[PDB]
């Protein structure tokens, strides 16, 4: 019973930290993708 | 075999010169839009 309960708890902890990890990757992904988009726009006017 | 057997032992004259085929459809290809940057927008799973 205790084995089952502790596996549940560690899985719960992993699940709890995973969301915030995803959010952080999302945040820094937006940060870089901004500069990606503007650099694309520079290359666009160069094509023009 | 056949006696119909068209006998004309001479060089012929060009009648219809070879031209570029007058088709308006399919010497081209199919257009395709793709970009990993439209997989950009993500949700924030917040409830649970």
């Amino acid at each position: 019973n205790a084995t089952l309960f502790n596996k549940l708890k560690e899985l719960q902890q992993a699940n709890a930290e995973k969301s915030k990890l995803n959010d952080e990757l999302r945040s820094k992904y937006q940060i870089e993708s901004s500069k990606a988009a503007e650099s694309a726009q520079t290359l666009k006017i160069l094509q023009e | 075999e056949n006696s119909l057997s068209t006998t004309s032992k001479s060089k012929r004259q060009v009648i219809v010169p070879v031209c570029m085929p007058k088709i308006h459809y399919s010497p081209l290809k199919t257009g395709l839009c793709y970009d990993v940057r439209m997989r950009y927008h993500a949700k924030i799973f917040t409830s649970y």
Side-chain angles (χ1 to χ4, degrees):
Chain A
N1 169 246
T3 69
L4 191 41
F5 187 80
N6 60 63
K7 299 153 193 178
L8 175 139
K9 212 54 62 184
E10 55 89 13
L11 208 52
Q12 192 286 321
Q13 178 51 255
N15 185 38
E17 58 87 17
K18 256 290 183 170
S19 178
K20 185 54 200 58
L21 171 62
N22 178 266
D23 285 333
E24 168 58 35
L25 171 55
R26 165 62 175 173
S27 281
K28 183 178 179 180
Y29 167 83
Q30 166 255 327
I31 299 315
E32 183 178 2
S33 295
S34 178
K35 321 279 163 202
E38 60 85 19
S39 86
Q41 181 53 255
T42 67
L43 186 64
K44 169 67 182 65
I45 313 159
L46 163 66
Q47 301 145 15
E48 198 295 314
Chain B
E1 295 182 352
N2 206 337
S3 171
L4 288 176
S5 76
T6 303
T7 58
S8 290
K9 291 185 177 181
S10 56
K11 45 167 299 300
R12 295 179 63 83
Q13 310 167 359
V14 172
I15 300 184
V16 178
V18 175
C19 47
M20 194 183 62
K22 308 173 178 181
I23 58 170
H24 75 284
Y25 208 90
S26 197
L28 306 170
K29 302 161 190 189
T30 304
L32 185 142
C33 278
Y34 175 87
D35 185 17
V36 62
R37 291 180 293 115
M38 285 170 306
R39 321 178 57 184
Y40 217 76
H41 187 40
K43 204 191 176 310
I44 299 297
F45 312 94
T46 320
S47 46
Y48 59 81

